[PDB]
Symmetry: D2
Amino acid sequence: CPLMVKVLDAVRGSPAINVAVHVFRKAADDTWEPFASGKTSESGELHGHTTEEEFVEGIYKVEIDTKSYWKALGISPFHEHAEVVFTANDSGPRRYTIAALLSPYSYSTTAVVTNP
Amino acid sequence: CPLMVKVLDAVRGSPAINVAVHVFRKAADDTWEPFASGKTSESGELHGHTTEEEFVEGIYKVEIDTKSYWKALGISPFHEHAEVVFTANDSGPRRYTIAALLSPYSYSTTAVVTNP
Amino acid sequence: CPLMVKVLDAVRGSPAINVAVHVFRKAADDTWEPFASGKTSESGELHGHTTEEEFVEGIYKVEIDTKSYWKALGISPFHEHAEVVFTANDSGPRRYTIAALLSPYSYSTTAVVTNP
Amino acid sequence: CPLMVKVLDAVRGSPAINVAVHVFRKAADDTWEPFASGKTSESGELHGHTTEEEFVEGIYKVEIDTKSYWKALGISPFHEHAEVVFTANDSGPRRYTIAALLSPYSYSTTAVVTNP
């Protein structure tokens, strides 16, 4: 799976488990088309069964449901979710790891792109 | 102004100047209505000329045109833009500063929420 | 003051107030001589009452007492403190802002370096 | 190896390879005693042959030679190095992953602590 998402909790110093993640790809008509979704595992990693074949060039959006994550822990956070929008595979197939680091009023997101 | 945006550049160690920023209010019909927009100043700040009265409770989106910023500096960026979505003024009007620190393959965002 | 420190709290969405900060100059004998110190203000800033003349080129260390800050808020922290080491004024006197954004298990630091 | 260090480059969106890392443990007399050192691999991960046995409770320091990393890529960075100081194993053995994300004028460091 050439698209991996990893989410960490900066308050607890742990993977952020059970976090809902939705992935969309921008379609010809400018709308977001559903692409993949899942929940993070005990390692904070998203369970993607995406193939290299269907992962074509385009603009992708990864939406991480951070608000429900914090709410379940009793915390009322600032952000509704964390969104990451990026062009993928514009110069050939790559493997992408989108990392998100979560705090109640702050998040950071980083991408590592490798050419296998 | 109850809603300020500040953008910093982690590569140059400076404010991010002349970056386009668009703010939207979510409308009843889950659609994003324009709310404020501009280019960041030499201090990396976006004016915000909105008043407390029009800045009612609701879900706001702040969209930062990070891709144009990096292209103008000649560095290849990962993200299409940086989008921050949050609920404002629940528990009453505060001053919000949305701060964003930019790198080509990473960004972080934090809210500094202060009660006057 | 050519050297300012600003500290933000990612959990509360606010400046980090009353945080101890110590600044040192490296001495010829690779030893850290005290240079400035204080507690951050309500805006999360450390006064810095040093003058341009005493703020000569050299390697400076900024030590932020993050562990006491988190203990005062009742949250278990990871780090003993946050230490930023940098060379200043090579290429001439600038204004330096060392900004630090704190979470219990994570911190980031950035320099906003501006030429007057 | 219950102590792992992973370093990423936020300019290139890649692991930071060949980065020197030194690890110290605070000794009885208050001085830093050398504990481990190495260079990051092609995955940005540090090659530690540390055992659970020798990794006792104490205060550890991880020093990452960020300046040499940037210099080798032609960039003159702000920081001399990135230091992470923390108490380990104070409540029993844990596995620690220290992650550092590097930009020329900024870095962030995060810890994930797991109980195996």
